[PDB]
Design a protein around this nucleic acid. Structure first.
Lengths: 305, 108, 333, 108, 333
DNA sequence: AGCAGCTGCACCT
DNA sequence: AGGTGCAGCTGCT
RNA sequence: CUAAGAAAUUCACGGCGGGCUUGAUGUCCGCGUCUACCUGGUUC
């Protein structure tokens, strides 16, 4: 959870058939826990052999479309499903529902390792981008390069080396190729102060996310309340509801060499910002922290504003 | 502040998304928007095509955007005679002051 | 020892959604600016033509029921009225390391499976399975109804190493049939490339384009979607066809089904030809399922006898187990 | 549980309606004897049967079709997390949402 | 023995949407760059003209309803005022293999069904059906209301092999009637080509152009579309016409219905014109069903007696079953 | 001479 | 485009 | 090591017949756009 020594771009990742539902209460963009798990898997499969550490991720969503439909002019939406194979007896199977989406994003990573000193930067960027184009990010595969266009080769920006004016001009250089979309950040303090503002009726925090994701109109004794941006309810980690078990206790475990815990989601608030309106590019990066004495396993973005 | 960023993203994704930009209708008049929110050189790039909008002073676009922003924020003697219209003009001036620095780092 | 209670494999050979565009033959080598075909709507009206009930026929009631027709609105996709052919483009990547599961509970079952797959690959390569997987790229089975009735189908396949073309392949998809698997001098290089990518080193990227001369203004057949309908006074369905960005398209799982049409070793007959590799191998366009568990020729009992009790099956039926390990799936005790 | 038992839950669910013996079916059998109208062994069997609704009732297990994700520790190994579905939170949010969509004061 | 529970066929005659354009007669040999016929709209103001129920047919209610007019907007397509001919162009392809189904559950049913169709084709070719199919391209029946009162109709038919013309046909569509099926020497070559396509021994793609001389500025009739909202008094759009990219057109199923107007074998009459082949052969304009199931002459009775019990239903009625199989559909349970 | 399986049927909001 | 539990049956033992 | 790992929605079809949108009308009064300038861009 230190300030990273370098930033690593992944310029235009096109993902096909990602997971759209992402929570028992929301359905939009996928959860940022998928992105932090992706960068941890990428660290496990590359950075042990290249002597670096990757911890931060910045989600800039260039574009997004979903496999949804609109029935009868109703004010709801449904999901386009897929056709499963037949049953053993050969009749049909029961349908489970899942949503799919096609997104195009960009990912900036933070490097803290000592491998930067002994090897060229473009080799590390090329090896990370080459290894990243063979696994998936959100349940959906990462699409490779298409013909009749010039592809984007990723670069390694150095953050802890140089003068401050050269620093600010490099951070203004890298924000040129990531402006089409926006960035996603977390807003725990804003939700807390908005709970404490209207706390004179009911102090339940869950009635605050369900008071910012709506259009509230208390008319004259025709006006619309000033939204300060784009507030979205997101999943914000997990929270345990069972004691920690032993590596052989629970049957049908995924691995018999790791303790297991039952768990519920936690819901927080987030915001979509333009990339120009931040101070630095390392404020965006998502991290995750666990308190195993409690049951708090939470990802968030620290050191932002 | 939000309305500035929406226009910035619309200029970055609208003209920059489509890979074509032909001659505008009435090029003696439709050239300010075609020069500011216009793409780079193309197959019709003449001699004075890649040496006109990148070599000239890209600072009239800020005043042109302020002239559009002045219509949205209504001014009159009710605000100009009071001391709130001065701050309401100074806020738009502080917003459009970065419109030449952030909107002028591409060509120059 | 026994079977792990949590077992899972990952899909190798994953394609993308194919996109459809239109143009004219003998300009297909400059088909990078061909415009996309689009989904439109039209209205149909038909009468009673279904097999009505065995005692509600009633020759005065059928006349009264014929005067009220049916009325719909459907989606439809056609070639333009000046375009001749149809172009279908997609990309494929072979992922490698086709023996290791994604999830396994025991550590003894994992190494027994590891050495079983190791003896299979050491005894014979992936050459038979790659030679059968490359046939469905050399012919054009991935265009399902767009292949019926065409007079000329050709397929161009190019291999992508860096941002440039490493090697190119051109086939004539109507000469290579849909019934037998024969080895040409040009199909073996593609089979060796797929077998080298399937053995674990990284990933191998190919781009597949198919041109079908279908007519002039004739209709084409993209995928259609499965939705749960609207239920009001308005038009409920459009018989919705699939689109990516205002361009008609085929799904990824449908092309993945077309590439998997491999096994001719199922015990019914080779009169239906090859079917798709499934456990309890069943066909959706047939209503029933071959490879029943009453015989011993399904996926689960063969893997249980090959890993646990150590009785290897015939060398033909050894290809089927490796085939649906390359396919993927979730299996648990 | 199994669907065929669900109607029996209706007989376990009427104790909170009309009377106040919803917690009086198993224990506090003063309302379970003059209204039960049975012997002592039948009353003990009924108190043992209706108290088993709130029991643990299962050995701690999971399945291969459940989730079970990995989560990273600060400088150590991992933890296995098995998320479940929040039925009661979903029911509370649904009751808060349908009233805002249509009801008495929302339509008035 | 019983019929299979899944049994589907596909259509063997594929037409496209027929687009229309306009020009002048005695220049129809240079009619490649003729401009299209566009759809406009206009306003109509009608009066009451329906039957009254004589419950509210009071002398004051009618005069009150006359003062409140109904105002509507309609779509309309006319010829230009300097042009007197309409040109309609489409393409058609004949596929063949018209006995084999698309889906089938039972394998004991489909083998003897293929046996029955094979003994039909071996006993007599596709010559009668192809003769009656080529008649309906000779007389331009696919122009439905654009054919009444016309001065002269002429039809050109080409045969396309590559991007070239292999054979050409010209016909006077008014000399060849809409009642009889009389064989010429030039119509039999087209009948032989269509039978060669339907049998399976060749690829057959045709393009059909029809010229109709009507008058300067007169009204033409394209296909009409469905309007979802109920007609609303006082300015609501009332009718819409079919279009492609800013050009009027006819649906493909409507010019396909005018090709299978074949059967004269229905038991009511034969001198009252041929109707279209259908199960329980029915005209929706007349509101009645010939080939009732109370007799033994519908499709599902003849097919279920020809296959399950082997009772040939006379040569005249055996072309009806094969024409229904060429049409397509889902038969069975 | 029973174990194990398997099919099929019914219950339910 | 239901899951779960039980009565019955088989069958070579 | 990512609410991880897996998946064919398909076969056929005639939208159609009719129609009168009309009748009148005043856009008016008044006005200071000024001061400066080497294309010796490479109008290839």
């Amino acid at each position: 959870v230190t300030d990273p020594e370098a930033l690593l771009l992944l310029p235009r990742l096109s993902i096909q058939n990602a997971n759209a539902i992402s929570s028992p209460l929301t359905w939009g963009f996928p959860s940022p826990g998928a992105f932090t798990g992706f960068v941890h898997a990428l660290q496990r499969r590359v950075g042990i052999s290249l002597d670096i550490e990757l911890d931060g991720v910045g989600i800039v969503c260039h574009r997004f479309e979903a496999q949804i439909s609109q029935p009868a002019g109703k004010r709801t939406k449904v999901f386009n499903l897929t056709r499963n194979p037949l049953n053993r007896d050969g009749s049909t199977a029961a349908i489970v529902e899942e949503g799919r989406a096609h997104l195009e994003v960009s990912l900036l990573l933070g490097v803290h390792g000592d491998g930067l000193d002994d090897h060229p930067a473009q080799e590390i960027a090329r090896q990370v981008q080459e290894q990243a184009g063979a696994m998936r990010l959100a349940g959906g595969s990462i699409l490779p390069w298409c013909n009749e266009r010039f592809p984007a080769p990723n670069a390694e920006l150095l953050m802890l080396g140089g003068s401050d004016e050269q620093r600010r001009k490099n951070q203004r250089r890298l924000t040129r190729r990531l402006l089409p979309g926006f960035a996603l950040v977390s807003r725990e303090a804003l939700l807390q102060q908005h709970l404490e503002t209207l706390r004179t009726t009911l102090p339940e925090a869950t009635t605050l996310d369900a008071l910012l994701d709506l259009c509230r109109i208390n008319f004259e004794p025709w006006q619309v309340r000033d939204k300060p941006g784009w507030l979205v309810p997101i999943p914000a980690g997990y929270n345990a509801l069972s004691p920690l078990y032993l590596p052989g206790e629970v049957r049908n475990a995924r691995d018999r060499e790791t303790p297991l815990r039952f768990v519920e989601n936690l819901f927080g608030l987030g915001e979509w910002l333009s990339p120009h309106r931040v101070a630095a590019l390392s404020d965006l990066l998502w991290y995750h922290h666990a308190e195993p004495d409690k049951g708090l396993y939470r990802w968030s973005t620290p050191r932002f504003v | 502040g939000q309305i500035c960023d929406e226009a910035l993203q619309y200029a970055a994704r609208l003209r920059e998304l489509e890979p074509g930009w032909s001659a505008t209708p009435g090029c003696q008049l439709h050239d300010a928007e075609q020069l500011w929110l216009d793409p780079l050189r193309a197959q019709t790039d003449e001699t004075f095509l890649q040496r006109r909008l990148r070599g000239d002073w890209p600072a009239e676009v800020g005043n042109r955007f302020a002239n559009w922003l002045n219509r949205a924020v209504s001014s009159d003697s009710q605000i100009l005679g009071s001391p709130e219209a001065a701050q309401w003009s100074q806020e738009l001036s502080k917003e459009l002051t970065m419109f030449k620095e952030i909107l002028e780092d591409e060509r120059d | 020892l026994s079977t792990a209670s949590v077992l899972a494999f990952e899909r190798k050979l994953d394609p993308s959604d194919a996109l459809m565009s239109a143009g004219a033959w003998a300009q297909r080598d400059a088909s990078q600016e061909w415009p996309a075909v689009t989904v439109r709507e039209k209205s149909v009206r038909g009468t009673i033509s279904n097999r009505l009930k065995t005692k509600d026929r009633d020759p005065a009631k059928l006349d009264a029921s014929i005067q009220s027709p049916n009325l719909q609105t459907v989606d439809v996709a056609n070639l333009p009225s000046d375009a001749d052919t149809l172009k279908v483009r997609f990309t494929l990547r072979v992922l490698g390391g086709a023996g290791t599961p994604s999830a396994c509970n025991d550590a003894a079952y994992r190494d027994k499976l590891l050495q079983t797959v190791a003896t299979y690959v050491n005894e014979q390569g992936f050459a038979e399975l790659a030679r059968r997987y490359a046939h469905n790229l050399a012919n054009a089975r991935f265009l399902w109804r767009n292949r019926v009735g065409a007079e000329a189908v050709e397929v161009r396949i190019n291999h992508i190493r860096q941002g440039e073309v490493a090697r190119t392949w051109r086939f004539d998809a109507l000469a290579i049939g849909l019934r037998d698997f024969k080895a040409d001098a040009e199909l073996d290089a593609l089979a060796e490339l797929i077998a080298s990518g399937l053995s674990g080193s990284g990933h191998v990227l190919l781009e597949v384009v198919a041109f079908a001369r279908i007519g002039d203004g004739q209709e084409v057949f993209p995928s259609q979607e499965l939705i749960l309908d609207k239920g009001d006074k308005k038009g409920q369905k459009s018989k919705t066809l699939y689109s990516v960005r205002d361009a008609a398209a085929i799904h990824s799982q449908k092309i993945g089904n077309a590439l998997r049409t491999i096994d001719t070793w199922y015990p019914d007959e080779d009169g239906l030809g090859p079917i798709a590799v499934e456990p309890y191998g069943s066909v959706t366009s047939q209503g029933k399922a071959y490879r029943q568990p009453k015989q011993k020729l399904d996926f689960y009992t063969l893997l249980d006898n090959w890993v646990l009790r150590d009785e290897a099956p015939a060398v033909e039926q050894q290809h089927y187990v490796i085939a649906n390990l390359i396919r993927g799936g979730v299996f648990g005790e | 549980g199994n669907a065929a038992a669900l109607d029996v839950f209706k007989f376990l669910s009427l104790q909170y309606q009309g009377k106040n013996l919803l917690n009086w079916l198993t224990e506090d059998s003063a309302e379970a004897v003059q209204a039960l109208s049975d012997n002592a062994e039948q009353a003990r069997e009924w108190r043992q049967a209706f108290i088993g609704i709130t029991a643990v009732k299962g050995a701690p297990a999971s399945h291969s079709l459940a989730k079970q994700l990995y989560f990273p520790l600060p400088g150590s190994g991992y933890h296995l997390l098995a998320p479940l579905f929040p039925t009661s939170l979903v029911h509370h949010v649904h009751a808060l949402l349908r009233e805002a969509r249509f009801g008495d004061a929302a339509k008035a």
